[PDB]
Design a protein around this nucleic acid. Structure first.
Ligand SMILES: [Mg+2]
Ligand SMILES: [Mg+2]
Ligand SMILES: [Mg+2]
Ligand SMILES: [Mg+2]
Ligand SMILES: [Mg+2]
Ligand SMILES: [Mg+2]
Ligand SMILES: [Mg+2]
Ligand SMILES: [Mg+2]
Ligand SMILES: [Mg+2]
Ligand SMILES: [Mg+2]
Ligand SMILES: [Mg+2]
Ligand SMILES: [Mg+2]
Ligand SMILES: [Mg+2]
Ligand SMILES: [Mg+2]
Ligand SMILES: [Mg+2]
Ligand SMILES: [Mg+2]
Ligand SMILES: [Mg+2]
Ligand SMILES: [Mg+2]
Ligand SMILES: [Mg+2]
Ligand SMILES: [Zn+2]
Lengths: 100, 141, 157, 143, 145, 67, 53, 112, 100
RNA sequence: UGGAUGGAACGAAAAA
RNA sequence: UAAUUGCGAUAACGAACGAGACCUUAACCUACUAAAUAGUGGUGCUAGCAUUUGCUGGUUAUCCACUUCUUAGAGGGACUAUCGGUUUCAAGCCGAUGGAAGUUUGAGGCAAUAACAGGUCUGUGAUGCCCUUAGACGUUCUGGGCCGCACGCGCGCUACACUGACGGAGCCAGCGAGUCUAACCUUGGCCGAGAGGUCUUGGUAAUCUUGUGAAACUCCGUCGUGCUGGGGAUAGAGCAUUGUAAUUAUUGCUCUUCAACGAGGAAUUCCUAGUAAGCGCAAGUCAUCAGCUUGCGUUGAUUACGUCCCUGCCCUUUGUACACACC
């Protein structure tokens, strides 16, 4: 049986909160992808979406500085005229290839 | 009367009866064509009985199925099992068994469960745990 | 106008109540079970006992008593309920009969070993094929314990 | 060669019939539209908000063409979903009723469905004229 | 399948209702930054403002921002069904309000002091800084501060 | 395992001991006559007995057997 | 007086009891037999309930 | 799988099935360590690897490679898998599987 | 004349005896009958803790009651109607006879 | 016709 | 061998219990008996599309016929069958073929001698002894407490997102429960964004709830690596339901408020196939309340088929200053 003092002391010690973290939590690059397009972007898309063996929403956001929505709307625009063919048009994963 | 047979296929808890009779070569799944087997991935999985033997063996016959119970995956295996067994039953009781020998060997050589139901059955749940084998958790101290 | 489920379980508790009552009533008369038989216009009860003339009583005074008790407490109209008492065959081949005799012998001061071997001998003589009697509790001491008396051979599983 | 609703893909038929109902725009609108959730189980109103009543009518229409009789109870059971009860585990909740009720009344006023004996709604004579002809047009669209 | 280039009228982070809402996100969710304005309220007000939800917040015509604000300050005048409002039957004038950015904490504080002044159980619990909704406190809310 | 208990071994030994000019190397016929010439409470036991009896007469066909 | 048993007993645990031991805890109301579990196990065979699996 | 096969087809125009089977062959660790001894002091000792374990390990290292890489990343798991597969199939020293493969090989040889 | 007889017993053996002799009596009287329909038996289950008190390993025990129910239709004259329900009463089997 | 030693490990109030 | 289960050896011979044997349940039967409270086909009446016969529906007294699917009762079926290896050459073991089924087919139920100073006098109108018994420790009534919080630990539920979130569509189970001196389980119609309200209806039940149109799941979309459209703790305002009575919010619904959490240290739990794991549904308590338990089904992996190293268990030999027995 603990003394009517030791427990109190323990409680006081315990109220040293702040929460043990056992973690590191290193920061990242904090990307700032473009959200609305412009002329100097637009022509960049037009001039270099060819010479790509594969384009996708991810492919046009990891290399280019545009966002996901910009990517999907671009792929929808580009294929309408016809530069890249569709071969699998499932949602959540678009697969398109250069016409040749 | 007209030549006709009827069989069934089964899975975990799904059953699929199959009416087969001489016709003009139509395949129906509860009032619809085979081409609307909702899962967009098992489409070939239910195409398998047709494609293994070739479509020509269907020009003269009609197959219609009714499937209930189970889940989508189990359901599909029910339709395919029903079609396969109805096919062999028809060849058994109207055509000679010469064709049977090749069609049966080709089926079994490609997959067993076309003609033989899967024997795996669910195991009852037991107290002291959330499953048939698992236990909750022991804490000694 | 009751669902068959509750009707059957009602029959279960029906048999239960009578069985428990009788074991609390006809102990000295060698009660050895009861059977219930339902017929149109009558539900019928059969008692299995040894001292049947005692179960009946003088001019059937006791049996009529029991008929009334079960009537009034079960809400039956006259003539719908009847009790017969019948002598049990092979009185030695009845555990409920034996246990009661063991009880009475102990209450009359008979010794443990003599009583138990009296019973196991009686049942063996009565054409049984295996018997065992177990007594537990305070036996001429403060620390409790049990003793087993057995003859022939039995099964357990 | 003859066709029916069951001869066309489920998604396409609904999209076709809803687009059909668009340009006449004479089905109905409850008025409290683009304010409600369609169910207590949902978390956000429909993203479309430019309709989705025509979609609802199309789906319930073919659903009745599928079954024999349907009521609001079955519509709620069908269209409900798994509600996220915050921290407690999820649970099934049937969808809103007033929505499907007004949908059924709208189809009544258009004459696609009617009250049926022994409860529920049945598809109408001229109703199936519409559903089959829409299905036919949808299928021959592939040419 | 449409990609319009732009016009140079786009503006980044802007200010309204004493709140610095972010740009370059969709308007309905941008308004969620407004204190006391949630998802449902923002969605409904923008639909009452006849604004297409798809444009990013920064790309928006200024002349209807004040229209939106006018909506949300007295929503009941614009056929808002009066059960969206977060403060109903309140305590003094009995009519229906909807508190916004700077008023939410003020109405919280004055409610708390009302209960303190009246010495109700809830007010006492708030003063002590404990749970008021009847939860157990034996094993939870340990490092609450 | 596939061990056959003594109530099977002894019973089969009995049948071999006193029913040789009888049941033959076929399991089916021995099954069909085991219940005819003996009393077995359960069919699973009867089948086990007949199976061992056949195994014994298989042993018998290659020389004798001890006991 | 008129307050000796005044409080209602139309529901809750106090409204019902084992028909044998008159306990309030551990009732089995399923199928409307109203017997607590520990009394129930003793009379299970007499009632006709048995173990099979 | 259907998607990642499409990816392996649009890139690297050879047969994707051949691509994956090459990746498996090139990602099976052929030597490994394990605990060996005769009592209180057992040590990391080198041992050869069964072909079945070679395949099973390869399939693992590939799948975990994709799952970790695509985790918390814009790239989809379907294309990330093919990225891992084609890199291992050609031999790149940039795929995760090769990292563990040669790491196990080097540890085994140093601790033979 | 279009009578329903239902059996709702607990014990199969005595149930089958009742079903057997009813159909046998009908056959020997040469009456048109609808064969005995054998409804699926229902199983009554209860699960309780084995221990009276609370301690020990958590062991659970389940009891069952099997009820078997059967029914038959007859087209029969009045004189025979009364005597089927007059005879074939034996315990453990509940019988229900009804018109319409 | 064979072959392995191989780390550390204290204590348990009186009576029945 | 899973087994003092067997082959056998043998100062032992002949026996009994346990295991096994046994019972229930899940798998096979186009074979027996059948079945509007289960179906199927055809025939009538009838709706739509093409028309050339046809395809898909609706229809109780339109009948006729059958039992494959469903339901049971009686039975059959696997006994490791046949073949090839391997061992005194026996009990056995391994592989293949055939087969619905070849780890005692899978899973349970029952389960020996002797014990624990394990738990329960709060289950008992089962109890010995002690205490109290009328300003009672009996019983009853009102209001609080069993939740109370500076802290420690156990079983769990939510999540840390893209193998994702949100919105529309698609659309599938099984185990069960249900009212008589009663208010149960509710279909259908109407009102209401919702919770819910109101007018009717079937069922004492394979027929009615209920095809429990469940969920996870699929298909189109919006989002986009930002403590963000992840996450929903805390808190404010209003509307209902259950209940005499909800105030330290019973629960449900609507709006707003939007905290930790970026995969978790030493340590530690369960598990070999429809099993782990994910997903829901029914029942128990129940006037109302599941984050619990007992069962049920849907989706369905990876990794052994081995060993005594750690923790333990069975048999034999050996040592012992132990016998409440290595604490
Ligand atoms: Mg599970
Ligand atoms: Mg849905
Ligand atoms: Mg989850
Ligand atoms: Mg991803
Ligand atoms: Mg010391
Ligand atoms: Mg010392
Ligand atoms: Mg018809
Ligand atoms: Mg051999
Ligand atoms: Mg077993
Ligand atoms: Mg006790
Ligand atoms: Mg407590
Ligand atoms: Mg526990
Ligand atoms: Mg069902
Ligand atoms: Mg959210
Ligand atoms: Mg409940
Ligand atoms: Mg509990
Ligand atoms: Mg020594
Ligand atoms: Mg000593
Ligand atoms: Mg020591
Ligand atoms: Zn009791």
């Amino acid at each position: 049986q603990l003394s009517k003092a030791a427990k109190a002391a323990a409680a006081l010690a315990g109220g040293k909160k702040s929460k043990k973290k056992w973690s590191k939590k290193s920061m990242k690059d904090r990307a700032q992808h473009a959200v609305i397009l412009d002329q100097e972007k637009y022509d960049r898309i037009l001039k270099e979406v060819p010479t790509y063996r594969y384009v996708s929403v991810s492919v046009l956001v990891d290399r280019l500085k545009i966002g996901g929505s910009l990517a999907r709307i671009a792929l929808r625009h580009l294929e309408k005229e016809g530069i890249i063919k569709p071969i699998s048009k499932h949602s959540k994963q678009a697969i398109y290839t250069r016409a040749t | 009367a007209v030549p006709s047979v009827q069989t069934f296929g089964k899975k975990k808890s799904a059953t699929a009866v199959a009416h087969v009779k001489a016709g003009k070569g139509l395949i129906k799944v509860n009032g619809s064509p085979i081409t609307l087997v909702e899962p967009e991935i098992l489409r070939f999985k239910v195409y398998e009985p047709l494609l293994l033997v070739g479509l020509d063996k269907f020009s003269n016959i009609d197959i219609r199925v009714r499937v209930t119970g189970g889940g989508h995956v189990s359901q599909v295996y029910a339709i395919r099992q029903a079609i396969a067994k109805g096919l062999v039953a028809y060849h058994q009781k109207y055509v000679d068994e010469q064709s049977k020998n090749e069609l049966k060997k080709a089926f079994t050589s490609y997959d067993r469960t076309l003609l033989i139901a899967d024997s795996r059955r669910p195991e009852p749940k037991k107290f002291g745990g959330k499953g048939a084998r698992s236990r909750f958790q022991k804490s000694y101290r | 106008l009751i669902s068959k489920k509750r009707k059957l379980v009602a029959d279960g508790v029906f048999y239960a109540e009578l069985n428990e009552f009788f074991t609390r009533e006809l102990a000295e008369e060698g009660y050895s079970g009861v059977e219930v038989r339902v017929t149109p216009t009558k539900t019928e009860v059969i008692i299995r006992a040894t001292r049947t003339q005692d179960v009946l009583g003088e001019n059937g005074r006791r049996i009529n008593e029991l008929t009334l008790l079960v009537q009034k407490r079960f809400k039956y109209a006259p003539g719908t309920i009847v009790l017969y008492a019948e002598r049990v065959q092979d009185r030695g081949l009845s555990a409920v009969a034996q246990a009661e005799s063991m009880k009475f012998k102990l209450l009359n001061g008979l010794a443990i070993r003599r009583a138990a071997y009296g019973v196991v001998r009686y049942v063996m003589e009565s054409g049984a094929k295996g018997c065992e009697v177990v007594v537990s509790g305070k036996l001429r001491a403060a620390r409790a314990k049990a003793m087993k008396f057995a003859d022939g051979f039995l099964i357990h599983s | 060669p003859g066709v029916s609703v069951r001869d066309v893909a489920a998604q396409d038929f609904i999209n076709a019939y809803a687009s059909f109902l668009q340009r006449q725009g004479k089905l109905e609108v409850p008025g409290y539209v683009d304010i409600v959730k369609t169910s207590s189980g949902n978390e956000m109103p429909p993203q479309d908000a430019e309709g989705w009543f025509y979609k609802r009518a199309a789906s319930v229409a073919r659903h009745i063409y599928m079954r024999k009789q349907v009521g609001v109870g079955k519509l709620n059971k069908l269209y409900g979903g798994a509600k996220s009860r915050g921290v407690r585990p999820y649970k099934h909740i049937d969808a809103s009723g007033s929505i499907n009720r007004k949908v059924l009344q709208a189809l009544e006023k258009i004459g696609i469905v009617e009250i049926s004996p022994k409860g529920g709604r049945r598809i109408s004579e001229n109703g199936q004229r519409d559903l089959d002809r829409i299905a036919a047009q949808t299928l021959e669209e592939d040419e | 399948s449409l990609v319009v280039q732009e016009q140079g009228s786009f503006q980044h982070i802007l200010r309204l209702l004493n709140t610095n809402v972010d740009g370059n996100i969709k308007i309905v969710y941008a308004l969620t930054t407004i204190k006391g304005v949630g998802r449902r309220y923002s969605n409904l007000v923008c639909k009452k403002a006849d604004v297409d939800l798809h444009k990013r917040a920064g790309e928006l015509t200024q002349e209807e921002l004040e229209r939106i604000v006018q909506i949300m300050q007295n929503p009941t005048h614009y056929k808002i069904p009066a059960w969206f409002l977060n403060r109903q039957n309140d305590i003094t004038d009995g009519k229906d309000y909807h508190t916004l950015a700077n008023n939410v904490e003020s109405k919280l504080r004055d409610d708390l002091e009302r209960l303190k002044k009246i010495r109700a159980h809830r007010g006492i619990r708030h003063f002590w800084g404990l749970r008021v909704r009847g939860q157990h406190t034996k094993t939870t809310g340990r490092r609450r501060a | 395992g596939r061990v056959r208990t003594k109530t099977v071994k002894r019973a089969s030994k009995a049948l071999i001991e006193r029913y040789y000019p009888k049941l033959t190397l076929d399991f089916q016929t021995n099954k069909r006559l085991c219940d005819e010439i003996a009393t077995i409470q359960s069919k699973r036991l009867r089948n086990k007995i007949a199976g061992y009896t056949t195994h014994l007469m298989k042993r018998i066909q290659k020389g004798p057997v001890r006991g | 007086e008129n307050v000796w048993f005044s409080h209602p007993r139309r529901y809750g645990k106090g409204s019902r009891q084992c028909r044998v031991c008159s306990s309030h805890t551990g009732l089995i109301r399923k199928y409307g037999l109203n017997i607590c579990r520990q009394c129930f196990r003793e009379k299970a065979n007499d009632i006709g309930f048995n173990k099979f699996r | 799988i259907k998607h990642t096969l499409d990816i392996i087809n649009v890139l690297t125009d050879q047969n994707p099935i051949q691509v994956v089977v090459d990746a498996i062959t090139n990602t099976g660790p052929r030597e490994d360590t394990t605990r060996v001894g005769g009592g209180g002091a057992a040590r990391r000792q080198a041992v050869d690897v069964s072909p079945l374990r070679r395949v099973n390990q390869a399939i693992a290292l590939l799948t975990i490679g994709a799952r970790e890489a695509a985790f918390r990343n814009i790239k989809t798991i379907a294309e990330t898998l093919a990225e891992e597969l084609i890199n291992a199939a050609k031999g790149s020293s940039t795929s995760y599987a090769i990292k563990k493969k040669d790491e196990l090989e080097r540890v085994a040889k140093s601790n033979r | 004349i279009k009578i329903r007889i239902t059996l709702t017993s607990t014990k199969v053996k005595q149930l089958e005896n009742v079903s057997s002799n009813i159909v046998k009596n009908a056959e020997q009287h040469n009456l048109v009958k609808k064969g005995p329909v054998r409804l699926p038996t229902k199983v009554l289950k209860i699960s309780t803790r084995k221990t009276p008190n609370g301690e020990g390993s958590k062991t659970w025990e389940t009891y069952e009651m099997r009820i078997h129910k059967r029914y038959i239709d007859l087209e029969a004259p009045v004189q025979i109607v009364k005597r089927i329900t007059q005879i074939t009463i034996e315990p453990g089997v509940d019988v229900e006879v009804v018109v319409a």
